[model samples]
Target: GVAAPQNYLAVIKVVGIGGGGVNAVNRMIEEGLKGVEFIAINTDAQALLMSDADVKLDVGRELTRGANPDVGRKAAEDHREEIEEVLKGADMVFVTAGEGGGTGTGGAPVVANIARSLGALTIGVVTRPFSFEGKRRATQAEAGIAMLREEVDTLIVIPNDRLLDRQVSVLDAFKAADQVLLSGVQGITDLITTPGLINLDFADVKSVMSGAGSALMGIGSARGDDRAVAAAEMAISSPLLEASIDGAHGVLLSIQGGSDLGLFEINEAAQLVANSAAAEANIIFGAVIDDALGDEVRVTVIAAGF
Candidate 1:
């Protein structure tokens, strides 16, 4: 699963799509992501359409049933064959749709639960709805994250207001948010394929956050410690999530395991050293570390460029 040192770097992106907005996400990937795998599902009926799958099932009309609470009824109605097909080879999996939708939203948790049961690492990635514009969609988004958090190993939640951050104009902010998400994802991919990383690297980072995969997240705040404080925790997650591209950068590492080995203490010291590292690393960013059970561990944070 590890590689020896090589002269160059290699990267690959895989997308397991679900939901009403999936086609749009697929479009974005096609436009911005070249040569990445794409899987899309619209309804339970579509789930049965797949021929090659490791875990396939449908979360039928429970979501489309228009305000129904029968999750089991919805799940059983899904296209089990296709979902299983995807799970067979899944080391990790990520979701980007639904908390109450007819398909991915209602079914995502069930699908991920199955993955975990099958011993696959599953990371749930969902963006919250924009307060004003995404009324219905917002509720669904929130529900999806909440459900997965209860069943999955890690939950990486990205807020929609990230689109309104002042660091960039409205339109620019959205683009930047997408860039940040992918950049974070890229860091994980790098951890996996990079050689001689030893313990934690890009792949571990990505896998943890991606799906069974480890997790990483991004957030911004204007308040003092309350807002900037998370950066420190993030540092705990990925002690190396830092970058040196320009005026802004951050790297947060948090080791949940090896408590007996002092990785947690080491990460905390690293966070306290954030100011120094920011100065030495030539960037402006905050970081932190925490022991999340000492195992079922995770490491993550956000890195920015100016």
Candidate 2:
């Protein structure tokens, strides 16, 4: 019997846990992301109903209505089998949530644990509560992050307090935070889905992120003269998470440009990031040409093991 030739595509899933997590998925859906399955998981049925993910799972139905991390954890545990089923065959999983809330705080780590156990490259994209949200929420968020850090290959934390720097209205501030999260997800997804002139496969991503601990993701774009250098500079200097990459152990840089892009420009961009990272850092670079970009160049940088 002759077996048919099969074209294998990477299985990527973005799972949003709890209310805040579900909201994040909804935002990404609205943005029209492609080539990834979106899953929304929450203890609240109402919230799950509101999400626009490809799949929806409601956990902890028999538990009480009041929300807390403990309850969230228990709910996830109760439906462990279901969770695993939904995440089956995933090559990479991005767990997104707004930490400090009951479900996101407690449930997200459990979900990440399962995803990791299934041999998926698990990365967490989370946001910490704003300073005005008070001490209790901050403390809970920290605790959730500590747990999530242990479960995932890499964790990217966006501090809501950073939004204050923009001085935008409260509604706009939250939207800005969502945009940062969306960019992190989009950047990585694009790297994998888009065909690059110099492609970066899943192994390249795993090498930098696996057991790499906390990480930072940044995206920068520019057009015309000095676009490559400018985009790279902005990406490295203005990461979503306000952290220094000086001691980072690994750096994954993806450059996207039009047909006019040059090798000289790519080298210049890579050199800038190399200079900023650790002397012994392992840097993996990839370049893609998108005619739709016209004369613009975009750079996405992920600094890990900081």
Candidate 3:
């Protein structure tokens, strides 16, 4: 089975559902991300046609797009067999959806289930509507979250309200949310698909995620002196996850830097994450070097817990 080093270590599936998700995936594609196949699934035919993803799936033409969550949910369940086809041979799967919407809230869980059924390590990312958007929307998203949690390995829920900046234009705020999605997808994909000086196996990831429930993935970068310490601190304290790491059951950490990446630096960063976990917490880690990283070091942490 071991022929050549050959391309990437794992086949990553990045799927986006609903308008917000499809748009985000399109933006991520515009970044020209390599080593992963982009898939956009939408109930919206217009949106599906608009995506630049590698694969596009449109479900429930009978009811048509933008119909409603119940219709979308039934369509997703009806197309379960067909949808499962695109998910095959994936080593890792990332699903992003905008909760509270028909297509996203209903279909995301179904997609995640399919991915998981195919034995892929699936992570579901979603956004909750803002308070002003109404309690009904928020409640719908919460229901979607509960359903999605049982299907995926880790569910990272982001609040759309928190994504806004008063001083920024609406477009910039939306772009910021897309940026967050891109960073997370990039970080996990990079860690799993690339070979590092200190390697982390896919099995290690599974072990960390098993009983840990949803994971909070955080990344931090620093350059110059004491970069390792600084990067670790940022990764631990990063507001990206909006969750605490104190009682985490396991911590999976990876260090990516330049040629200057050192053992001591690695130890320092790994230790910072390890110390933040519960005393009995299990920790898996690794490191990768990128010349383009120059003197800057970026620490990626997936602190998982129940």
Candidate 4:
């Protein structure tokens, strides 16, 4: 969640699709993520939110926690304009909706595909519903997870149950995830604006988090690996120069200054954590994050890139 100093000029278009997707994006943008933009859409007009968005779309569909002929039905039928508009100019997207439903489940990946087609780097942060959320969300989430693979540049899925698997709940997962993602925004933004910090891009920041996040929430550090332990801690707190004393749960990494890690370790760790976070994999997204960071590695090293 921390970052090296940066020149701070990333034109990031953050689009949120379906359910509670919009709120998550807004939380990051309002904090002034340099060069970042926002786009959000949802089906549950009630569960749907359109605030704090650079542009908002309500693709009215019953993507609520129900089936009722509403799930995934409207995305293909009623959300053309919203999807087209958002995808046309976005850098990445984070799609979610509690667990699964219609708008978020169906529409999110479609939007990411559109962005990729337009040559944008796309990222999706999604969730799987809890058994308690019922079949509506669970069913949709299952399908959405599969579908996202085809549509996004990378997908980071944070199932509502990941954090709660062992005495956890979907709600707890959501709260934990919120803390993880929010801290990432704050840490990177703060460091990017800091004078002594190294210059880095949002992609680099995301990559770092992806690695660090997986370690914190997805999997605990290797039994004797201090770097793993330290990285995980830094993933949650600011003042990246100092390890975050608090335990962390989320992370993002990119290619700016994070390339020095062992390739095998990075790949293995990401996959491990991903599976830990989702019932499948919390570390599904792909990026040159490590590479970018390795390229930027400097002694007294605050960060590294490919």
Could you say which candidate leads in lDDT?
Answer: 2
- Report residue 167 deviation for candidate 4 (angstroms): 7.8
Candidate 1, residue 261: Cα displacement in angstroms equals 33
- Candidate 3 overall lDDT versus native: 0.78
Cα displacement (angstroms), candidate 2, residue 145, comes to 0.2
Residue 152's C-alpha lDDT in candidate 2?
Answer: 96
lDDT of all predictions: 0.43, 0.83, 0.78, 0.47
Candidate 2 ranges beyond 4 A from true positions? 1-6, 62-67, 193-198, 239-243, 257-263, 289-296
**What are the TM-scores, per candidate, against the unseen true structure?**
0.51, 0.88, 0.86, 0.55
Query: Clashing residue pairs, candidate 3?
Result: none
- Which wins on lDDT, candidate 1 or candidate 4? 4
The list of candidate 3 runs beyond 4 A from truth reads 1-9, 62-64, 131-134, 193-198, 290-293
Q: Which scores higher on TM-score, 1 or 3?
A: 3
Ranking by TM-score: 2, 3, 4, 1
* Model 1: ten consecutive residues of lowest lDDT: 282-291
- Lowest summed lDDT window (length 10), candidate 4: 297-306
